[PDB]
Design an enzyme around this catalytic site. Structure first.
Site, mmCIF file in Angstrom:
data_model
loop_
_atom_site.group_PDB
_atom_site.id
_atom_site.type_symbol
_atom_site.label_atom_id
_atom_site.label_comp_id
_atom_site.label_asym_id
_atom_site.label_seq_id
_atom_site.Cartn_x
_atom_site.Cartn_y
_atom_site.Cartn_z
ATOM 1 N N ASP A 37 0.807 -1.210 0.000
ATOM 2 C CA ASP A 37 0.000 0.000 0.000
ATOM 3 C C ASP A 37 0.844 1.265 0.000
ATOM 4 O OD1 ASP A 37 -2.049 1.873 0.260
ATOM 5 O OD2 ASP A 37 -2.307 1.462 2.392
ATOM 6 N N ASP A 223 -1.376 5.378 -5.699
ATOM 7 C CA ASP A 223 -1.865 4.512 -4.646
ATOM 8 C C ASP A 223 -2.140 3.085 -5.086
ATOM 9 O OD1 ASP A 223 -2.702 3.650 -2.251
ATOM 10 O OD2 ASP A 223 -4.602 4.743 -2.240
#
Ligand SMILES: C[C@@]1(c2cc(NC(=O)c3ccc(C#N)cn3)ccc2F)C=CSC(N)=N1
Length: 379
Positions: A37, A223
């Protein structure tokens, strides 16, 4: 040094559930699958037998565990995890041959955090300390890795995917077999998220003529922890309106554009009625930019688990945001993406593994002349 064969294909996953790398924590080592992440900065893992979890961090078994005697409550816009902070020895079996003492949040309570059916039991926040919970004193894993070892301050991501996905996370370098053509770099605007500046948008080559400042309101980030290309509602409106116009030989319910319904065919998808999407990103040089182009193959994702339908159903994975632009899996899966932390920049190239047809390809092109790119940043 350009070839990291040990680390190639170290990412696994399921459509809609993200990419995970195998990690070990504690002594003796306890193996865990950890979501990759770039949108957060905590290394947090399941530490209690939540029934959805395949496995969990068991501190009582680790001889190298240290307690920080601090806790942390981490809410998102739906929902949350709460954890006990500590340190322990971490390594990445299919990554650099090293062991690191890192911060670890042992998750002891959550809601809507772990996914039912998922095969990962933790999350690796790879963004900067500024967004670390509870505060910036809690050093993120990558920072600890670089500080304690000779791993260079760079990692790269090749998210491939397609019910199971795949990819490579190259820690400490770049692997040139993973991309074709040339890397193009855009500045990391600030070291909190991986913030970048979009300076122009086209749909099938057509501009959008919006104030570029709108594109980055209030933020544009890269992201790996989000599926969608998420856009600010204004940009979303203009984008969909243009995508609608480019697409108008087929009529689609309004709900589909809004992510409220799926659309199904039975492999008869009219990919070619759907436009390509181009984002120009601030380049390395004054008045110089570059272009990344994705296919409908990226923003129209197959929804596997539809019991009610025998057909192939797809989701429109471009959605509206209130936290600015999120360049998620929809973007990254077109590209080999180099998070060049050392030089405060992010590199893009065509992914050797991205999915396309015989007509259109994901592309990275440059250079272009673009003035006033600084005015595109929101303050
Ligand atoms: C920390 C987090 C976060 C991210 C995720 N990520 C995912 O479940 C996910 C799912 C599919 C894909 C894809 N492709 C990526 N990430 C799950 C929980 C969570 F709390 C918060 C919101 S968005 C983000 N970047 N990270």
């Amino acid at each position: 040094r350009g070839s990291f064969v040990e680390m190639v294909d170290n990412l696994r996953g399921k459509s809609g559930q993200g990419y995970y790398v195998e990690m070990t924590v504690g002594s003796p080592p306890q193996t865990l699958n950890i979501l990759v992440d770039t949108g957060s900065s905590n290394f947090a893992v399941g530490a209690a037998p939540h029934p959805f979890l395949h496995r969990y961090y068991q501190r009582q078994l680790s001889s190298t565990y240290r307690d920080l005697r601090k806790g942390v409550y981490v809410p998102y816009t739906q929902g949350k995890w709460e954890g006990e902070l500590g340190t322990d020895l971490v390594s990445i079996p299919h990554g650099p041959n090293v062991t690191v003492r890192a911060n670890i949040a042992a998750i002891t309570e959550s809601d809507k955090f772990f996914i039912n059916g998922s095969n990962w039991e933790g999350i690796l926040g790879l963004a900067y300390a500024e967004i670390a919970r509870p505060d910036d004193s809690l050093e993120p894993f990558f920072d600890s890795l670089v500080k304690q070892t000779h791993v260079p301050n760079l990692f790269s991501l090749q998210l491939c995917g397609a019910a199971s996905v795949g990819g490579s996370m190259i820690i400490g370098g770049i692997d040139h077999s993973l991309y074709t053509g040339s890397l193009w770099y855009t500045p990391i605007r600030r070291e909190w998220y991986y913030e970048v500046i979009i300076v122009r948008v086209e749909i099938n080559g057509q501009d959008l003529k919006m104030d570029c400042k709108e594109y980055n309101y209030d933020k544009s980030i890269v992201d790996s922890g989000t599926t969608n290309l998420r856009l600010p509602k204004k940009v979303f409106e203009a984008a969909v309106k243009s995508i609608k116009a480019a697409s108008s030989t087929e009529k689609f319910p309004d709900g589909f554009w809004l992510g409220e319904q799926l659309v199904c065919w039975q492999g008869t998808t009219p990919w070619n009625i759907f436009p390509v999407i181009s984002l120009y990103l601030m380049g390395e040089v004054t008045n110089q930019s570059f272009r990344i182009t994705i296919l409908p193959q990226q923003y129209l994702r197959p929804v596997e688990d539809v019991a009610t339908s025998q057909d192939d159903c797809y989701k429109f994975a471009i959605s509206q945001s209130s936290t600015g632009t999120v360049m998620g899996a929809v973007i990254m899966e077109g590209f080999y993406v180099v998070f060049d932390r050392a030089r405060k920049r992010i590199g893009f190239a065509v992914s050797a593994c991205h999915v396309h047809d015989e007509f259109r390809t994901a592309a990275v092109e440059g250079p272009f002349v673009t003035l006033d790119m600084e005015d595109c940043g929101y303050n």
